[PDB]
Write a protein that binds this ligand. Structure first.
Ligand SMILES: CC(C)[C@@H](NC(=O)[C@H](CS)NC(=O)CCC[C@H](N)C(=O)O)C(=O)O
Ligand SMILES: [Fe+3]
Length: 330
């Protein structure tokens, strides 16, 4: 009845945009400490206009129509859209499934992009609603991709320094022309009555909207409304992550755990059921399809690892399928 608050420090990441190397190292230390503890931190002083993000996302969610949702739907909901595994609309099912969302990928994945031409898995051309019906939405959303890409680049410099590397150790694989990163614009609704079929129950009795998992990402860069919902598993049990709709919640995904030999673990976390209208807006920091980082271990004098190199595209395609199998099609 007294779930403890998780330690989730607020780290001023602004030095990671600049050229003060000592200041950057002090930020890197804070990232290291958070990554070794609960595995979460809030990035503050990140430079992104999150109120405007929330506003523009709200305008999209509260004006998309049922017709548009079918017309944008991913393959899981619309068999006519065989090319849409990742990008498009993820429908709710009233009475059964409350959440709904819209996912988009790299705006540079155009019809003439070489990976689109090659039909390489996990690369897709984004689908968008009609401009007249959603004026400004596509432009805003594409610009948001680049704003959060920029923040993520800076965060990756911090993680690299934290791990004893040069600052471009990760960021050199995180490029505008080929990143597999995605934005998801998630709506969690208020519903009265709320369908019990859309509520899961954890082993400890907690009511959930999304079960325990580790992220399929290098890092995850998340903005949410100010409604508490996330919990992180620690040695002391599940602990509540306090909401902060001015900051970005950051954690590592399982690709970071792999390449650090679990020195930076991918924290296990879950989403509590809350009957409230809220937004959840993750950016999944994914590398390029052929990106391979040689695994290492910063706990060992020679840094040698017992893990094999894994290309990012292989990791991602299989990880996304496995997460659907484990925790359901969202
Ligand atoms: C905890 C939040 C990040 C959010 N959960 C999520 O977004 C969950 C768990 S990290 N993520 C996923 O299902 C993976 C979506 C990947 C996306 N379709 C893509 O093709 O790249 C939630 O609010 O439920
Ligand atoms: Fe997650």
């Amino acid at each position: 009845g007294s779930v403890s608050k998780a330690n989730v420090p607020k780290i001023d990441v602004s030095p990671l945009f600049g050229d003060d190397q000592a200041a950057k190292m002090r930020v890197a230390q804070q990232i290291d400490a958070a990554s070794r503890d609960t595995g979460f931190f809030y990035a503050v002083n990140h430079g992104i206009n999150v109120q405007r993000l929330c506003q523009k996302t709200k305008e999209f969610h509260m004006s998309i129509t049922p017709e548009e949702k079918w017309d944008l739907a991913i393959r899981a909901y619309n068999k006519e859209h065989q090319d849409q595994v990742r990008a498009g609309y993820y429908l709710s099912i009233p009475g059964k499934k409350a959440v709904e969302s819209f996912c988009y990928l790299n705006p540079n994945f155009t019809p003439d992009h070489p990976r689109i031409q090659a039909k390489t898995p996990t690369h897709e051309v984004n689908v968008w609603p009609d401009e007249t019906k959603h004026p400004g939405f596509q432009d805003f959303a594409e610009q948001y991709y680049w704003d959060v890409f920029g923040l993520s680049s800076a965060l990756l410099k911090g993680y690299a320094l934290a791990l004893g590397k040069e600052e471009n150790f990760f960021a050199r694989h995180f490029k505008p022309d080929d990143t597999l990163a995605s934005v998801v614009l998630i709506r969690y609704p208020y519903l009265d009555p709320y369908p019990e079929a859309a509520i899961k129950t954890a082993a400890d009795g907690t009511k959930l909207s999304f079960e325990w998992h580790e992220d399929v990402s290098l890092i995850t860069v998340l903005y949410q409304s100010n409604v508490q919902n996330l919990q992180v598993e620690t040695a002391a049990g599940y602990q509540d992550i306090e909401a902060d709709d001015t900051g970005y919640l950051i954690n590592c995904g399982s690709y970071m755990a792999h390449l650090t030999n679990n020195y930076y673990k991918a924290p296990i976390h879950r989403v509590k059921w809350v009957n409230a209208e809220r937004q959840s807006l993750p950016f999944f920091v994914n590398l390029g399809y052929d990106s391979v980082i040689d695994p290492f271990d910063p706990r060992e004098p020679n840094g040698k690892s017992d893990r094999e190199p894994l290309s990012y595209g292989d990791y991602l395609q299989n990880g996304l399928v496995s997460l659907i199998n484990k925790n359901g099609q969202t």
